[PDB]
């Protein structure tokens, strides 16, 4: 009786949300951007090839200086690269080799990683002993760690396969805030440029907008037909794009609270592992299981280019803060740096 | 056209390369085993004889080092991390023989033996384990012999039309799991009957892994 009444109210509220979203959907992003000129063909060349990983690479993250990057591979090594000279700055042996995510602190003094061990380990790069050592091990997740992003040297937000996200105080090692509401494994998270909000993508084919300070879900975004694997904020922080197993990339707007564009092609039938935007947000770069990275025109939903240089699945990618280059990691155990030429 | 500090940075990078190469060669000589199975299937008893989210066990047997990975505690979606074990030497799958007339505690209607068969075929026929051999352990042999006298195998297998003896019932169950192999050319299933007091389980794994090592050597050398 009471339980039956409540579940009917949830359906009515969902209908109210759907009608409200349809009310404000006066036009389409494709119609608005129909007039603008296309970006043409985007051609990029492999400037650098980062060799040294002897297993599949699952994660990479650029530093804020747009020169240092960290890569996570399941050979049990966390490697920090000098992308300019391909020099290996550090090689961090991991206690658990089943690492699925890695992060670079915006200060550059710390890197994080975590995988099937359910632990987010914080590594100190600036020590008086001259070696990289573990500063903290963040325990409390009951599922594998799928993504993590530093807010500062003391705060980090992590997502897990236990359907929850957590905000941690690194000094104390405890999760100050827990983000619940996903009904499937959370696979990715992306911090807003102001680090006041972040979006997460889970296996329930939904994306959620979270308030970091308040600790509650603000908006929920649906539309994908399968697990969301990648998520990335637009540069202005008013939109984000997701990558899912249904071979589609979709763009959602926070203020519109609805999907604005779908980035799909008939020849593309494989899952999407990683998504990232260019500096201006005009280009949406996505990694796929078909061993390629496709460049998308975010405003016009046209494939602008293809980064085909990997012999296995492209598992990760990232664009530098200055937009100068894009790095792609892959299961073929290589990282490549890409940029265009005049 | 490097500076004095650039040259020393390159020298540091090559020292890192030397240690990465050393670690990879050490890692290539090690045996990685993905230990799978259902609950109360004797899977934990296997670890006890071979002394977070994933439990990793290391043991050395006859100049060979084994890495056994237990993913029983990972209650998340298997398909999101099962591909992380693509490349293991083999898979050890534990099946409780005595759990044929029993039913799942939660479902209360699905047979425990069929639950193992359903999990066995979703792992054996998985796309990430196309050519990965399976070391199939059939545990609780002594308990199965006691139960077969009272509870016939026809409760689990209605199509079974053999004698109500261990020597024939155990063979029928062994063939049922092997018949689930959807690719009988790229992989082989090594079936062993273990128990709670057996001491030849580690010896069997060494024999089965040795065959996998030979098979991979033949492929790399071009003979196969």
């Amino acid at each position, epitope marked *: 009786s009471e339980l039956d009444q409540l579940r009917q109210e949830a359906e009515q509220l969902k209908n109210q949300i759907r009608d409200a979203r349809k009310a404000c959907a006066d036009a389409t992003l494709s119609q608005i951007t129909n007039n603008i000129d296309p970006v043409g063909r985007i051609q990029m060349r492999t400037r650098r090839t980062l060799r040294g990983h002897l297993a599949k690479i699952y994660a990479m993250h650029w530093g804020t200086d747009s*020169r*240092l990057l960290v890569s996570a591979s399941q050979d049990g090594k966390l490697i920090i690269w*000098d992308s300019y*000279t391909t*020099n290996k*700055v*550090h090689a961090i042996p991991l206690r658990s080799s089943w690492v699925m995510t890695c992060a670079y602190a915006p200060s*550059g003094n710390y890197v994080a990683c975590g995988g099937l061990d359910n632990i987010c380990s914080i590594y100190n790069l*600036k020590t*008086r*002993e*001259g*070696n990289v050592r573990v500063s903290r091990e963040l325990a409390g997740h009951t599922g594998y760690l799928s993504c993590c992003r530093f807010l500062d040297d003391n705060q980090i937000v992590t997502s897990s396969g236990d359907t929850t996200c957590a905000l941690w105080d690194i000094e104390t090692g405890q999760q100050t805030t827990t983000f619940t509401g996903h009904t499937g494994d959370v696979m990715s998270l992306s911090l807003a440029p102001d680090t006041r909000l972040f979006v997460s993508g889970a296996c329930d084919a939904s994306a959620k907008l979270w308030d970091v300070r308040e600790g509650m879900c603000r908006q929920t975004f649906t539309g994908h037909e399968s697990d969301i694997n990648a998520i990335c904020f637009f540069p202005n922080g008013n939109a984000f794009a997701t990558g899912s197993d249904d071979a589609t990339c979709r763009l959602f707007d926070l203020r519109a609270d609805q999907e604005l564009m779908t980035y799909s092609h008939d020849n593309i039938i494989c899952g999407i592992t990683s998504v990232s935007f260019s500096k201006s947000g005009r280009l949406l770069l996505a990694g796929y299981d078909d061993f390629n990275c496709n460049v998308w025109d975010a405003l016009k939903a046209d494939r602008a280019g293809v980064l085909a240089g990997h012999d296995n699945r492209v598992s990760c990618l990232g664009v530098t803060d200055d937009g100068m280059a894009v790095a792609t990691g892959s299961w073929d155990s290589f990282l490549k740096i890409w940029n265009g030429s005049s | *056209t490097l*500076s*004095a*500090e*650039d*040259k*020393a*940075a390159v*020298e*540091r990078s090559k*020292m890192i390369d030397r240690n990465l190469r050393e670690d990879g060669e050490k890692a290539a000589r090690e045996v990685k085993l993905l230990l799978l199975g259902a609950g109360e299937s004797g899977k934990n008893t296997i670890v006890k004889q071979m002394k977070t989210g994933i439990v990793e066990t290391h043991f050395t047997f006859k100049d060979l080092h084994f890495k056994m990975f237990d993913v029983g505690a990972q209650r998340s979606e298997r398909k999101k991390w099962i591909h992380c074990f693509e490349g293991v030497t083999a898979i050890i799958f534990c099946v409780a023989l005595s759990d044929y007339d029993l039913v799942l505690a939660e479902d209360e209607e699905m047979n425990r033996m069929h639950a193992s068969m359903k999990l066995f075929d979703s792992i054996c026929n998985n796309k990430w384990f196309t050519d990965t051999s399976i070391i199939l352990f059939l545990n609780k042999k002594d308990l199965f012999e006691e139960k077969i006298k009272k509870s016939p195998l026809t409760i689990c297998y209605p199509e079974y039309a053999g004698s109500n003896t261990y020597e024939e019932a155990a063979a029928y169950i062994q063939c049922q799991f092997e018949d689930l192999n959807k690719r009988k050319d790229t992989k082989e299933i090594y079936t062993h009957f273990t128990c709670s007091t057996d001491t030849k389980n580690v010896q069997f794994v060494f024999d089965a892994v040795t065959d996998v090592i030979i098979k991979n050597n033949l492929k790399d050398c071009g003979l196969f």
Partner: single-chain antibody
Amino acid sequence: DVQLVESGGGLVQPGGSRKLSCSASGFAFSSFGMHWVRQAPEKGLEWVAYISSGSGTIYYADTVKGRFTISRDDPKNTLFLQMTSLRSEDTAMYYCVRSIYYYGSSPFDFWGQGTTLTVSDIVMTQATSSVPVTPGESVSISCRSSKSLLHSNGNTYLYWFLQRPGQSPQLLIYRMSNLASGVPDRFSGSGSGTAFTLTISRLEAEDVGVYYCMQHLEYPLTFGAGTKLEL
């Protein structure tokens, strides 16, 4: 804590041989390149020899090449300087210096206390030998080089060291602009090309000492004469 202890110094006869040892503790010794830098009595700093991490690269000063041998024992965390045919020119306090080389690192960050041995090329110029100073007053120290220390990679390999009286040299500025860890922000390094300036705002008592500028553009590493601040 990071510690470098030198031993083996003492009075020797001319033409003899002496062995210097440097004991390292509190840091990853095998990951650091090691230097020997000597200082003759009432004289400036003089670089002697360098052995890289892993013993792959070795450099010597011309005044000591052929007679001095630098070696390291990574398991025992010890640095060695075997010296032969010792002359009166070799009478100096020898320092054990650690330096690690990767992108963004700070070489020459830690110096040993040094051992005294008694025996019975880019030019760095610091014209101003002494500067009368008062607390709370801004002081600028100038350094010059014969060759431009700016490299094509964008770095200007100029280092500043402060040797307080009775103490080992202390790194202040590395690569001409970056502040070493643990150094107050009042120290600042500025320069361009061949001329460089070290600015000390709100001078204090601890800032009293001799300031050296070293170049790391190429070997041999050379120091300036040294600018002394006195009250």
